[PDB]
């Protein structure tokens, strides 16, 4: 996954 | 829209204790584990990566190995609860919980650890 919430990035692995 | 909340955004924990930090997300009827992502991190360190009902331990940081658990029974209540045992001084800092179930959100939680001190 590559998810952006309020300009913060969350990525797998 | 899909919103994550935190009952408590600051935990003050004793060195060596266990802590459970939580985040809430919206649930209705079935929770399809296939579609749910729960992620916990701190700094550059992955703690939990729970995807399609499976934890990927290959990505988990060594410092959390055998110490960190998602309380998966809490998920039906809309609670992503991270339990850390044997809390270290180094466990103090800013944790992020991210949940995705169609929509996605995150929140911050600060942990402070009280160093051992004899009364």
In sequence order, the 6+-apart residues with CB closer than 8 A to the CB of B105 are: A5, B2, B3, B4, B25, B98, B99
Experimental approach was X-ray
Q: How many CB pairs under 8 A join A and B?
A: 26
Looking at the complex, does the CB of residue A12 fall below 8 Å from at least one CB of chain B? yes
CA dist list (Å): B79 to B9, B22, B43, B70, B82? 14, 7, 22, 10, 9
Q: Which domain holds residue B61?
A: 1-119
Q: Based on DSSP, count helices (H) and strands (E) in chain B, helices before strands.
A: 0, 9
Count up the domains in chain B and report the number. Answer: 1
In sequence order, the 6+-apart residues with CB closer than 8 A to the CB of A10 are: A1, A2, A3, A4, B39, B41, B96, B98, B104, B106
Q: What is the resolution of this structure in A?
A: 1.5
Looking at the complex, does the CB of residue B59 fall below 8 Å from at least one CB of chain A? yes
């Amino acid at each position: 996954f590559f998810i952006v919430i309020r300009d913060r990035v969350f990525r797998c692995g | 829209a899909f919103t994550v909340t935190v009952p408590k955004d600051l935990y003050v924990v004793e060195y060596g204790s266990n802590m459970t930090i939580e985040c809430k997300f919206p649930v209705e009827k079935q929770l399809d584990l296939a579609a749910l992502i729960v992620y916990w991190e701190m700094e550059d360190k992955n703690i939990i990566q729970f995807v399609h009902g499976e934890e990927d331990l290959k990505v988990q940081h060594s410092s959390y190995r055998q110490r960190a658990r998602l309380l998966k029974d809490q998920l039906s209540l809309g609670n992503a609860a991270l339990q850390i045992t044997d809390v270290k001084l180094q466990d103090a800092g800013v944790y992020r919980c991210m949940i995705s179930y169609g929509g996605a959100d995150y929140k911050r939680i600060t942990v402070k650890v009280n160093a051992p001190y004899a009364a």
